[PDB]
Design an enzyme around this catalytic site. Sequence first.
Site, PDB file in Angstrom:
ATOM      1  N   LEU A  14       0.831  -1.195   0.000  1.00 23.99           N
ATOM      2  CA  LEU A  14       0.000   0.000   0.000  1.00 23.99           C
ATOM      3  C   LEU A  14       0.864   1.243   0.000  1.00 23.99           C
ATOM      4  O   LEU A  14       0.595   2.169  -0.756  1.00 23.99           O
ATOM      5  CB  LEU A  14      -1.023   0.012   1.162  1.00 23.99           C
ATOM      6  CG  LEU A  14      -2.175  -1.009   1.120  1.00 23.99           C
ATOM      7  CD1 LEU A  14      -2.926  -1.032   2.435  1.00 23.99           C
ATOM      8  CD2 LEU A  14      -3.143  -0.721  -0.017  1.00 23.99           C
ATOM      9  N   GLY A  15       1.915   1.226   0.801  1.00 26.77           N
ATOM     10  CA  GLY A  15       2.847   2.341   0.913  1.00 26.77           C
ATOM     11  C   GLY A  15       4.107   1.985   1.667  1.00 26.77           C
ATOM     12  O   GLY A  15       4.138   1.003   2.410  1.00 26.77           O
ATOM     13  N   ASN A  18      11.366   4.742   4.673  1.00 26.94           N
ATOM     14  CA  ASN A  18      12.454   4.226   5.490  1.00 26.94           C
ATOM     15  C   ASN A  18      11.893   4.220   6.906  1.00 26.94           C
ATOM     16  O   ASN A  18      11.747   5.272   7.537  1.00 26.94           O
ATOM     17  CB  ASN A  18      13.778   5.016   5.327  1.00 26.94           C
ATOM     18  CG  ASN A  18      13.659   6.521   5.366  1.00 26.94           C
ATOM     19  OD1 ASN A  18      13.260   7.162   4.386  1.00 26.94           O
ATOM     20  ND2 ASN A  18      14.051   7.118   6.484  1.00 26.94           N
ATOM     21  N   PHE A  19      11.427   3.029   7.311  1.00 31.76           N
ATOM     22  CA  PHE A  19      10.765   2.638   8.562  1.00 31.76           C
ATOM     23  C   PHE A  19      10.238   1.223   8.307  1.00 31.76           C
ATOM     24  O   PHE A  19      10.392   0.333   9.147  1.00 31.76           O
ATOM     25  CB  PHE A  19       9.576   3.569   8.895  1.00 31.76           C
ATOM     26  N   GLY A  20       9.661   1.045   7.117  1.00 36.61           N
ATOM     27  CA  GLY A  20       9.080  -0.197   6.631  1.00 36.61           C
ATOM     28  C   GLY A  20       8.010  -0.014   5.573  1.00 36.61           C
ATOM     29  O   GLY A  20       8.193   0.754   4.623  1.00 36.61           O
ATOM     30  N   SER A  21       6.881  -0.727   5.740  1.00 31.19           N
ATOM     31  CA  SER A  21       5.783  -0.673   4.782  1.00 31.19           C
ATOM     32  C   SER A  21       4.408  -1.015   5.367  1.00 31.19           C
ATOM     33  O   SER A  21       4.277  -1.531   6.487  1.00 31.19           O
ATOM     34  CB  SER A  21       6.081  -1.583   3.588  1.00 31.19           C
ATOM     35  OG  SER A  21       6.039  -2.952   3.963  1.00 31.19           O
ATOM     36  N   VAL A  22       3.383  -0.739   4.567  1.00 32.55           N
ATOM     37  CA  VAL A  22       1.992  -1.057   4.865  1.00 32.55           C
ATOM     38  C   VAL A  22       1.545  -1.895   3.687  1.00 32.55           C
ATOM     39  O   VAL A  22       1.757  -1.508   2.545  1.00 32.55           O
ATOM     40  CB  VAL A  22       1.075   0.185   5.115  1.00 32.55           C
ATOM     41  CG1 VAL A  22      -0.353  -0.246   5.460  1.00 32.55           C
ATOM     42  CG2 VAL A  22       1.645   1.077   6.222  1.00 32.55           C
ATOM     43  N   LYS A  41       1.061  -3.145   8.929  1.00 33.58           N
ATOM     44  CA  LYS A  41       2.270  -2.318   9.020  1.00 33.58           C
ATOM     45  C   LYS A  41       3.424  -3.175   9.586  1.00 33.58           C
ATOM     46  O   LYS A  41       3.258  -3.922  10.559  1.00 33.58           O
ATOM     47  CB  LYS A  41       2.037  -1.056   9.868  1.00 33.58           C
ATOM     48  CG  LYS A  41       3.162  -0.050   9.770  1.00 33.58           C
ATOM     49  CD  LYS A  41       2.845   1.229  10.521  1.00 33.58           C
ATOM     50  CE  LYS A  41       3.770   2.327  10.084  1.00 33.58           C
ATOM     51  NZ  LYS A  41       3.680   3.504  10.979  1.00 33.58           N
ATOM     52  N   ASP A 132       3.011  14.441  12.763  1.00 29.38           N
ATOM     53  CA  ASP A 132       3.031  14.179  11.334  1.00 29.38           C
ATOM     54  C   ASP A 132       1.680  14.420  10.626  1.00 29.38           C
ATOM     55  O   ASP A 132       1.290  13.629   9.775  1.00 29.38           O
ATOM     56  CB  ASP A 132       3.547  12.741  11.106  1.00 29.38           C
ATOM     57  CG  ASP A 132       4.126  12.444   9.741  1.00 29.38           C
ATOM     58  OD1 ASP A 132       4.508  13.405   9.034  1.00 29.38           O
ATOM     59  OD2 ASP A 132       4.184  11.260   9.372  1.00 29.38           O
TER      60      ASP A 132
END
Length: 287
Positions: A14-15, A18-22, A41, A132
Amino acid sequence: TQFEERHLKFLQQLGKGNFGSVEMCRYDPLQDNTGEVVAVKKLQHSTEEHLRDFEREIEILKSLQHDNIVKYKGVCYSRNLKLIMEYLPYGSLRDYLQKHKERIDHIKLLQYTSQICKGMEYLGTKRYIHRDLATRNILVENENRVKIGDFGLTKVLPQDKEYYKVKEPGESPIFWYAPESLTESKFSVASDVWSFGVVLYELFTYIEKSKSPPAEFMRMIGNDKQGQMIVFHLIELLKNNGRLPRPDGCPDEIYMIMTECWNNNVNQRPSFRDLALRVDQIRDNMA
Ligand SMILES: CNc1nc2c(cc(C(=O)N(C3CC3)C3CC3)n2C[C@H](O)CO)c2c1ncn2C
């Protein structure tokens, strides 16, 4: 509750970042394709610092129950912790707005604004600082409901202070940041209000690329400026009351809310309850 990883069927990313992904997954324990589609997530590169930051984020989301906050569904353990949330079918408000520009009127934008303010007031009640707020972090459940859709940078205020000082490594969304967040790394309900003003701006520009906050500020600062200098020049521009323009077609009373959110004096910024009242009053007048 707990979800077994073996029954989580990958459908689509999905998205990222730099942290990871969904990811979009289908949790199908009966393996009969009757399971629900969920949003997952995960951490891409996980230190012990990232793992602990993600554990706090899961606790923060688990603690939130509101119509305008994405639902926590559970966790998934392997070494590799995953956060399971409900799937919101229309994606980010940024993408939804951009695709339905001609079908979404100012009354509709104010309905979304009001929901964001209400979800944010709920956050403040728990002494949580989002850090954010941007339309890319707001998700669309349906044409009548939006939800704060990510809490990756959310911090809990210390019990003795009304602000939280934090300087995270990496690229910070500086064109949404309050002056004191840029100069001193201070985050509070008041810097969330400043970023909310930017969200309000984003909405009334209908996400025009040329009219985006990085584009407008980068023009005011000069595209000839680069690197660490951009931050320095942005600080000066804000200090000298340089602000994002009134978006095309935006009523004066809506731009007035934006400019009031963009006060240099932290204490002079409106509260989320007042923002919600004001927005509601304006949309009642419009109706
Ligand atoms: C389509 N439905 C969903 N899309 C999602 C997320 C989360 C992201 C996403 O990637 N991020 C956003 C939180 C801010 C970001 C990485 C953290 N995206 C992408 C988005 O659709 C772009 O249009 C989601 C959805 N339903 C529930 N959730 C949690």
